[model samples]
Target: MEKLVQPTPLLLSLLKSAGAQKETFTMKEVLYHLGQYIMAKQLYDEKQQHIVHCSNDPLGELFGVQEFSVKEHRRIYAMISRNLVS
Candidate 1:
């Protein structure tokens, strides 16, 4: 079974707002849920499809950037993982 990790307080709030509703999740699960949220919000940049626009406060805070390239999507997992606790 995959190990489950609880989110940091900040991440917890974000996940909750995103409708994850779970206290703990596997890394993949977290990524999946957040991806759904982003898609639902249509947070992609209009001028650059590869760029994800973090227009919402929660996304902006979590990513620590106003926008990021889709190529860097996996890299942001490091930041998210840092906010998880085993």
Candidate 2:
């Protein structure tokens, strides 16, 4: 069974900025929305397809990083998971 969880206030605000307006979601859904947000904003590094440029305030603040490698995507999810309800 999928575990559904609510985002904390901060996470909700960040998710909202990512265009994912929802009361709750599975972690995968959150990652999906974040992925869409990044793509919609064209946040990938200009010279590196495997690197994501987190220049937007929402994602930058959420992940606390200016950039990250696509190979480290799990770390991004881990960061987001920290903001979920315990």
Candidate 1, residues 12-49: lDDT per residue as tens digits?
87777778877989888888787777777888877788
User: What does candidate 2 score on TM?
Assistant: 0.80
Clashes of each: 0, 0
Q: Can you write out model 2's per-residue Cα lDDT over 11-53, one digit (the tens) per residue?
A: 7876777788787998888878777777778888888887888
Candidate 1 Cα misplacement greater than 4 A, ranges: none
TM-score of each: 0.79, 0.80
Q: Which candidate is the best by TM-score?
A: 2
Q: What is the C-alpha RMSD of each candidate to the true structure, in Å?
A: 2.0, 1.9
Where does candidate 1 have its weakest 10-residue lDDT segment? Answer: 55-64
Clashing pairs in 1: none
Please give the RMSD of candidate 2 to the true structure.
1.9
